[PDB]
Ligand binder design. Structure first.
Ligand SMILES: [Br-]
Length: 129
């Protein structure tokens, strides 16, 4: 797909890249990591035993209101079956757009933000169930 890329972990590192880019790269059991390559309403249409979905926002420079509403729906619906959706690598600008479009109307959703993918992975290790 051009709109998302599935990432894996280079074993025994904090490096996450395209699962197809290198043979020894492996997905982490229980976690799906998707790099967003196009506005999320696109990647979402493709989407349509996992405890955590990590969305890598490193390539995202801004979000529009349609995208934030789409993301909010993704977070809510996974959440409703107990799966956390983490947002990794959001720029200050992206978090500003999220905020403007009322993504953090419930301030608890700030806990879904992490600076790096590895930070998100570690954050999924132990948390309220
Ligand atoms: Br977006």
């Amino acid at each position: 797909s051009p709109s998302y890329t599935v990432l894996g972990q280079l074993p025994d590192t904090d490096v996450y890249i395209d699962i197809d880019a290198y043979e020894e790269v492996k997905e982490i059991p229980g976690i799906k990591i998707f790099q967003i390559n196009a506005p999320i309403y696109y990647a979402n249409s493709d989407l349509y035993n996992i405890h955590t979905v990590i969305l890598d926002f490193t390539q995202v420079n801004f979000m529009d209101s349609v995208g934030v509403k789409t993301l909010a729906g993704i977070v809510k619906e996974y959440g409703d079956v107990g799966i956390y959706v983490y947002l990794a690598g959001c720029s200050a600008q992206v978090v500003n757009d999220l905020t403007s479009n009322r993504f953090f109307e419930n301030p608890a959703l700030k806990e879904l933000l992490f600076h790096s993918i590895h930070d998100a992975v570690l954050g999924s290790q132990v948390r309220e169930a």
